[PDB]
Structure formats: C-alpha cells, structure tokens
Amino acid sequence: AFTQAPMLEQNKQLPPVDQRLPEKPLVIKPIASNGVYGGTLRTVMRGNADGNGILRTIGPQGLTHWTQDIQTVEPYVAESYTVSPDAMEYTFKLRKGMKWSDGTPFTADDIVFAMNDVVLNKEMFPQTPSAYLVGGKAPKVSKVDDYTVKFEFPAANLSFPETLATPLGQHPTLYQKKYCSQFHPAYNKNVQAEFTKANVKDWPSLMRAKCSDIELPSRWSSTERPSIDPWLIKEPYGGAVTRVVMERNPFYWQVDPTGKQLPYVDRIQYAVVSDLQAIILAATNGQYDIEARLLGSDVTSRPLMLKNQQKGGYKVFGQTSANANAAGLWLNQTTKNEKLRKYMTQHDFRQALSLAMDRDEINKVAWLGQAAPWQSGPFKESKWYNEKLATQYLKLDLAQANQILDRLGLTKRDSDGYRTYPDGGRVSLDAIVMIDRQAMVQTLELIRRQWQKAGVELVIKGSERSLFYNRATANDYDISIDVFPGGLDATLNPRAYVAVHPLESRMSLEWAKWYLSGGKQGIEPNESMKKRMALYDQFVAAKTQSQALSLFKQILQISADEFEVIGTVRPAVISSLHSLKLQNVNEKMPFGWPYATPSLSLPQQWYFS
C-alpha cells in the first residue's frame, strides 16, 4: 500500500515498509504540495547547550499536536482520543503496529511506563512536572488494552490536550519501556550494578543519563536511545562537537496523502556555531535551508537578511511571536522601599508612568521602527483579546502624566528638578535588567530620559543573569524588565495577569510565593490579586469550555482594571528564512516555544524542489 524513500529501499535489511509503518499511519496533509524524497536539511545551533534547537527543528512527537493556526489540537501519536463529559478522563487510542526506531512495538505499555514508572515516580521527579497535574494533583494512568491508555484526573482538566501538544507535555511518548526498564529498579533487580559503570549514585541519575528528559543534553548525545522521532541522532550533540547529524527514522509512523512514508528529507545537518554573528553571516549567504529560531529577534540583522535573499537563494518570512510585549516593566508592589510603595500600589501612579513613556521613540531607537506600541494583553487574533488590556495608556501624554503626579501629592521638587515624596526623598525607582539584553537596556535608558520630564528618576541596575534573578527572588527591585507572554499564549503563560509564576510574576514574586504555598509563605496579595488567584484555580478546574472562557476573561478584565505592568512595544515581526528550494514551510505560522517553532510547520513534510 505504502511507499518509502529510495535510501530505505536501498536497504534490504529493513522490514517491508508496510510492516515498519502502523496499520493506520497518520496521514499528513502538506502545507502546499505533495513532496519528493531526498536531500540534507542544513541548519544551525549556537554553542553546545542549544539542544532545544534540535527539538524545535524536528518537533516533539506528542499524543496531540497543534493545528497550524494554533487554535486547537488534533490527535498526533494517538490515533484518536475521547474525553468524559466531566472533563476528568482522557482515553487515548494508539496506532496498532506502530514501532520505535529500533523496530520494536510502540504500545500502551510504553505510555503507562513513561507515566507511572518515570513521570509520576517520586525518586525520578520529586516535583511532578506540572504538565500532568491539575491544581497540583496527579492523574491515575492505566492500561485499558494493548493500544488504549486512560488518564483519570481528580478534577476537570480541559487544558490537557493542549498541554500534550507542547514540548513539556511530551513525556508520555519519550520513554521506551524495553530500553528504559534496564535502568529502573522495579524491572532490573540488579540495576545498582549499572551505577559505577555509568558514574552515577542512584537510578534517577542513571535514567536521566541514558533515557533523558525533555530538555536534557542527554536527549541528543547518544545513538542508542530509541525514539519515535522523524530523524534519529547519528552524529551526536556532545558538549564540544562542531556538527550534529540526524538521519531519517526507518520506522517513522506517518505518510503523506499519496502513501509516501515520511519524512521527505533524508538527513538534517546542524552546524554548531559559537558566535551569533557568524551564524548571521552564514545565514545571509544562504548556507542554511532553514533558520527560524536564532536570527529573528536581532532587528539589527533584518536589513541584511532582506537584501541578500537573491544572492543567497533564500526567502525571508515574518512570524508573529506569541509574546504580548518584547520588554515590559514589571512593577513590584511589594517593594521594600516604603516611601515608593505608597505610590507603587496606586493605579493612577502606574498610569502616570505609562503616559510619560514615548513608545514611538522606543520603537524607532531600540527596534529600528519594526515593533509597535502595546501593553500586556492578547492580540486581536486571540480569543482572549481585551481592548483595555491591550491599548490603554499607550499614547504619550506627558501633560496628563504630570497632572496625575501633582494630584498624588508629588509636587515638591529637589534642586535637580525631580519630584519628592511628602516625607522627603527623590521619587526614584530601581529597574533591574540583564546587561546582555541590549534592546532592553536601551529601552530603559530611553525611559529614564523620558521619565525625567515627569520628574521621576529611573535607576538602571544591569547585571548578569544570576544577580538579576537573585535580586528578583530576594524582593530587591522596584521594576524588572522582561517579556510579557500572552499575545497568543495567555492561558499557557498567564504570568503577566495573575501572580502564579514563582520567578517571573514580578508584579510581586512574594505574592506568587503566597499563592504557591497556600498562604503560609510570601506576602498576602491585595484583594484584586487574591480574587484573580481564586478565579485562576476555578479556571484550571473549569468543567466546561464556556465556564473556562468566562473565568479567564474575568481575570484579564481585572488585570486590565489594575494596570500592574507597563508594556513598551509588542515584538517586531520575527525574521526567519528558508531556502527557495525548500517547500512546504508554513510562512504564516506563529513563533514560540509552546508550539516548538519552526517544527509546528511539520518538518517531516518539508522537501527540496
């Protein structure tokens, strides 16, 4: 029934293609055209700790997969799934006859092993990955038959199919029972014997070294770890290698609509390059068939990328980042500065700071005019769009900023012209920033000059990553600048709207610590934030789509009313490229880690014309 790549037909030692495929392979409809076999995809990683560059090239092979427009998911590794009307139980049907890369059967036993003996095993994971929890509670995972697996959660868990389409939700398909059980004491009663050979103290360390985890280097550094990936490691991603090579999985489990077993492309070759400038040089000379991850953020490179398209033989395409803001101001409402805190906690003070900002200037200078003014809210293309959350207080209005600050009682000036607190002291805010993030540093320098005209002093505290994070978790900052997620991914990454992320909800990480500790640690949030946290717990456990929509829209509305975080610009278009010869790249796909882009575009159906 099916056909195969010439390089596999060249291999007389493989089983027949019909026996390498499942009985019912997943049929992949191409982005643009039915493809032809062959070729080597040339791409690039920066340094030797860039393993997600492989994952975002080949794609997580999860139980479900995002649609191209990322509005929902469809069965992927699973042939089909069902959900109970209370949304607590998900049952997945697997593809009979599907095989791992080593030709052995892929069955419910593998999913149940991955969940019950790895993911939910507390020696392996003392903290269970949140992808498999609802309100912090784990499901019961059970084998129904050789090709059916059931997940039973203790509360409704409507987001689970979406979670299973993200890179962090792929554990269910990551662990082959046969191979991995060798390193597990419930199966290998002599496993302690493997420890010294592998230089490990315990079996979780052995399991991580041999069988790995979503983002561990060990995922890509061995050639013997079985997978269901479209290409397989052949020259591995060691810590000092200069190139990685992957080759088609002869047991890949998908066909195109003509019955060709995928992928079309035979091999992927990754250059490992230490200097981002050398990557830009190579890319703008056409040496990569795809680069849609590393170059797109450096707006300084777009002019040369565009100019050299004809010379290099490539096409630039623009992608919309999922992030709502490229460099947003997180205002710390639990700042230890008691005089400042009296104003930081006032909505109108935060409003005044936003009105004193000139986002057109920030865009022109920091982003070469390629971004656009924006606050924190989802984009119009998102079902979560809230006009107020997106666009309030965006236009420069220095007169109104000063009117508000006068009304708040900050009229007395010091000898330098700055406003002072009633009790004395310059109105001054410390902003922490990671020094190597140049556009963010430049953004803060611009805001510093702009806020001077409102009589407010911004003190830039740039540092390397460790001190930047240590300052945040120590509650030692007034402002922190970093991205606002939520343009497209608001429910996946809600950190700007409700203080649930322990490192990044920097309207107050002490508030987040209170939320995550059941109120025993951290600092009790204000009523509007406690209300959102309660709504968020209700949302995660919502029993119907309509209830979930209502609850999360309410969170976004309260966030808009409170105006806790101040956006500068939504990201410029992400400049990506592919060779003109490379077909079936979805140039309309969004950009983002939750969709593992560019692999969202189904690289197994890219092909060379």
Author numbering: 2 to 610
What does the paper say about this structure?
SPH1118 has been identified as a pectin-binding protein involved in both pectin chemotaxis and assimilation. SPH1118 shows high homology with the solute-binding protein (SBP) associated with the bacterial ABC transporter. SPH1118 consisted of two domains with a large cleft between the domains and substrates bound to positively charged and aromatic residues in the cleft through hydrogen bond and stacking interactions. Here we show tertiary structures of SPH1118 with six different conformations as determined by X-ray crystallography.
The space group of this crystal was C2221. Residues 1 and 611–619 were unable to be assigned because of the poor electron density map. SPH1118 consisted of 21 α-helices and 5 β-sheets built from 15 β-strands. The C terminus of the C terminal domain (residues 573–610, Fig. 2a cyan) in SPH1118 formed a small additional domain and was located in the direction of the N terminal domain. The surface electrostatic potentials of SPH1118 calculated at pH 7.0 showed that the cleft between the two domains was positively charged. Interestingly, SPH1118 showed three conformations [SPH1118 (open form), SPH1118 (full open form), and SPH1118 (closed form)] even in the substrate-free state. The crystallization conditions of SPH1118 (open form), SPH1118 (full open form), and SPH1118 (closed form) contained the substrates (ΔtriGalUA or sodium PG). However, no substrates were bound to SPH1118 in these structures. Compared to the C terminal domain of SPH1118 (full open form), those of SPH1118 (open form) and SPH1118 (closed form) were closed by 18.9° and 34.2°, respectively, suggesting that the domain of SPH1118 was flexibly opened and closed even in the substrate-free state. The crystal structures of SPH1118 (full open form) and SPH1118 (closed form) were obtained only under crystallization conditions in the presence of sodium PG. Conversely, the crystal structure of SPH1118 (open form) was obtained under several different conditions other than those shown in Supplementary Table 2, indicating that SPH1118 (open form) was likely to have a more stable conformation than any other substrate-free conformation.
